[PDB]
């Protein structure tokens, strides 16, 4: 086939996209962001969202 026709490794490549979305949604990603950023809310962001 040809990539122009439909695109080789198109849907397969996007498979990782779903995993990324789930990871971002999870609080784990937020932790990496807060820790990496080095800036804490110390008010609302800090602790449970509630």
Residue 45 is assigned to a structural domain of this protein: no
**CA–CA distance, 25 with 4 (Å, rounded to integer):** 34
Residue 13 is assigned to a structural domain of this protein: yes
Structural domain span for residue 2: 1-36
Residue 49 is assigned to a structural domain of this protein: no
Residue 43 is assigned to a structural domain of this protein: no
How many domains does the structure of the chain reveal? Answer: 1
Angle at 29 between CA 10 and CA 37, to 5 degrees: 120
Residue showing tokens 């397969």: 12
Residue 21 is assigned to a structural domain of this protein: yes
**CA–CA distance, 12 with 24 (Å, rounded to integer):** 20
Residue 2 is assigned to a structural domain of this protein: yes
**Helix residue spans in the chain (DSSP H):** 15-25, 27-37
């Amino acid at each position: 086939e040809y990539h122009l026709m439909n695109g080789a490794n198109g849907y397969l490549t996007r498979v990782n996209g779903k995993y990324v979305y789930r990871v971002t949604k999870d609080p784990v990603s937020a932790v990496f962001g807060v820790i990496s950023n080095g800036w804490g809310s110390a008010g609302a962001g800090f602790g449970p969202q509630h």
